[PDB]
Design a binder for this molecule. Structure first.
Ligand SMILES: Nc1nc2c(ncn2[C@@H]2O[C@H](COP(=O)(O)OP(=O)(O)OP(=O)(O)O)[C@@H](O)[C@H]2O)c(=O)[nH]1
Length: 177
């Protein structure tokens, strides 16, 4: 499985380059993927994310982290298979978990025709920007390479992957780590 990293509160300055404990935010995402079973990583970039594109080219230039260019998943062109689309702000994300998500996705198609939604119980996640009847989106999803409709299932984990949308969000992010 390969992966896609999707890249204005708190200033609307590109977050992915926001710095936490000396590392940019995206490094935290990239790190798990690499240790990650998901081998190739595609980092979708866009304007105001130019600086990001650069850090990435320069930073992972020696790597196989490739940059791509509302919601455009003008990226299906790349994956011939279902990929993991992750936001560029996750905290506390681990490869072990990831194995489970991708592993889980298939166990299912064990009985299916898809997209997967990974959500955290509210008990685990605090100060959630979004809560859908008690489930908080982790910003990690499995998807198929299509531009239309997908039958999306839901996966639940008691682990917490926090995403940052706000500055206070950052405090918590640092508190976690
Ligand atoms: N290139 C690109 N990335 C996006 C776009 N929308 C969301 N993302 C990425 O997907 C992740 C989840 O979206 P958000 O957390 O809402 O990012 P955001 O839109 O900058 O946040 P806001 O300040 O509320 O607008 C973010 O880390 C973004 O990097 C987009 O339209 N273009």
């Amino acid at each position: 499985m390969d992966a896609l990293i999707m890249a204005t509160r708190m200033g609307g300055v590109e977050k992915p380059l926001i710095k936490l404990c000396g590392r940019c935010l995206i490094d935290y995402v990239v790190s798990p993927l690499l240790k990650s079973k998901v081998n190739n990583i595609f980092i979708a970039t866009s304007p105001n994310t130019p600086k990001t594109k650069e850090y990435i080219n320069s930073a992972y230039k020696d790597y196989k982290n490739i940059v791509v260019i509302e919601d455009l998943n003008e990226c299906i062109g790349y994956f011939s298979e279902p990929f993991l689309v992750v936001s560029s702000d996750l905290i506390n994300l681990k490869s072990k978990i990831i194995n489970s998500i991708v592993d889980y996705f298939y166990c299912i198609k064990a009985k299916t025709p898809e997209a997967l939604a990974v959500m955290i119980p509210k008990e685990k996640y605090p100060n959630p920007s979004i809560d859908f009847n008690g489930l908080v989106p982790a910003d990690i999803n499995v998807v198929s390479p299509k531009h239309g409709y997908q039958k999306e299932e839901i996966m639940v984990i008691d682990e917490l992957i926090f995403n940052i949308n706000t500055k206070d969000d950052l405090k918590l992010a640092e508190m976690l780590l």
